Amino acid sequence: RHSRLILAILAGLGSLLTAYLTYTKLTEQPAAGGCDLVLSSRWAEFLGIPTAAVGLLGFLGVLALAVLPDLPLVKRWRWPALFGLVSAMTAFEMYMLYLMVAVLRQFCMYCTTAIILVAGLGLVTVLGHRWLGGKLAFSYILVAFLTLVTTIGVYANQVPPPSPLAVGLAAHLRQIGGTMYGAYWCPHCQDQKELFGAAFDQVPYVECSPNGPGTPQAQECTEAGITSYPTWIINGRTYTGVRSLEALAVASGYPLEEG
């Protein structure tokens, strides 16, 4: 009933899953729109390293605390440190779940498995030790609060302010009607979006499939003959795929002056 063996098994699986995604990211390989959108977005990097690598430190941390024999400072600190680390991992994961449901409007199976593994860690840590109550409910909010504040703070400080070029080009494309045709699940459309940053709000955009993947595309895009995403229509011309700000400036007739 009281066991940390399950913690080693769940943290073992977690360490493996999150290390594959770290290997996947660093070797530039794709993992199995779906995960492609999720794992290639901003948010998939945290403090200059992959977000999975942060999960690697956590999953290996809980594994180490479970494996070590009761050695200096272990028996005393093992179980309060397990509650601290796992609570931070549950809190981070709820923000990860929030991003998928609310902001990315999609899911990834590797990411979903991590949530269930971390939720499993949360249940076993609560039901595998005796701390006789109101302390744990309070210690959870404290760790969660500190986790969320730091996490949200890191991601807010992450995305840089848009360049003058991004702000100017967007407003110019807005004036000439330079429209981008794409999808919200579309990973390449996210790449294009991230080149403008916050300045993308100005950019005229048509959502080609509001219903999602596997559903017939919207009328507006079908009338324009859009076959793949993203697709730009600028001054009668058609450009397929992700284009740099420099290339979109040339296409729009936006002056790139360096003299």
Side-chain angles (χ1 to χ4, degrees), residues 1-70 72-259:
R1 75 280 163 85
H2 279 29
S3 183
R4 70 192 189 203
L5 176 79
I6 298 98
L7 291 172
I9 297 160
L10 290 172
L13 289 164
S15 299
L16 278 159
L17 175 86
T18 196
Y20 166 74
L21 298 171
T22 307
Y23 166 84
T24 288
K25 184 80 88 69
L26 296 168
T27 324
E28 293 147 291
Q29 301 278 146
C35 283
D36 308 47
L37 184 282
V38 170
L39 294 164
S40 302
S41 74
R42 80 167 186 97
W43 290 304
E45 283 215 283
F46 195 91
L47 254 32
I49 60 158
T51 296
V54 186
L56 187 55
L57 268 294
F59 275 122
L60 284 171
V62 48
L63 177 65
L65 290 168
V67 166
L68 283 165
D70 50 55
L73 277 74
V74 277
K75 168 62 205 158
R76 170 165 274 271
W77 301 112
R78 173 165 295 154
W79 283 101
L82 277 165
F83 191 80
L85 191 67
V86 171
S87 293
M89 289 172 74
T90 52
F92 197 99
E93 223 76 46
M94 287 188 294
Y95 187 76
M96 285 308 104
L97 182 68
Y98 162 80
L99 293 177
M100 297 195 234
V101 179
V103 90
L104 289 174
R105 292 150 70 183
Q106 270 230 334
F107 272 93
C108 173
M109 64 182 182
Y110 292 98
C111 301
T112 304
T113 311
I115 302 166
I116 303 166
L117 281 167
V118 166
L121 282 178
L123 198 83
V124 175
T125 308
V126 164
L127 305 176
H129 189 269
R130 292 203 215 174
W131 254 118
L132 280 306
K135 209 90 67 216
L136 295 161
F138 171 66
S139 300
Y140 180 82
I141 307 166
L142 182 68
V143 174
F145 193 83
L146 288 161
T147 302
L148 294 164
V149 165
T150 308
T151 305
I152 292 156
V154 162
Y155 286 132
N157 196 31
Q158 184 194 46
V159 53
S163 58
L165 179 63
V167 181
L169 180 60
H172 180 81
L173 286 158
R174 188 184 158 105
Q175 269 298 312
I176 64 160
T179 321
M180 174 190 158
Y181 297 85
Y184 69 102
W185 79 77
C186 158
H188 285 224
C189 307
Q190 192 178 232
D191 280 28
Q192 183 68 260
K193 194 186 191 177
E194 222 69 35
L195 292 166
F196 282 88
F200 195 81
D201 307 346
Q202 314 274 125
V203 179
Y205 168 79
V206 178
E207 178 61 47
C208 284
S209 297
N211 297 127
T215 55
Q217 74 163 358
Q219 198 179 127
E220 197 168 354
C221 298
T222 316
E223 299 290 316
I226 312 299
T227 56
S228 60
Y229 318 120
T231 304
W232 292 84
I233 297 174
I234 300 154
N235 297 322
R237 268 266 70 202
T238 302
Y239 310 93
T240 311
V242 190
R243 303 295 161 108
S244 67
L245 305 181
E246 198 180 79
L248 285 163
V250 168
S252 61
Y254 188 79
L256 295 154
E257 202 70 26
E258 294 292 294

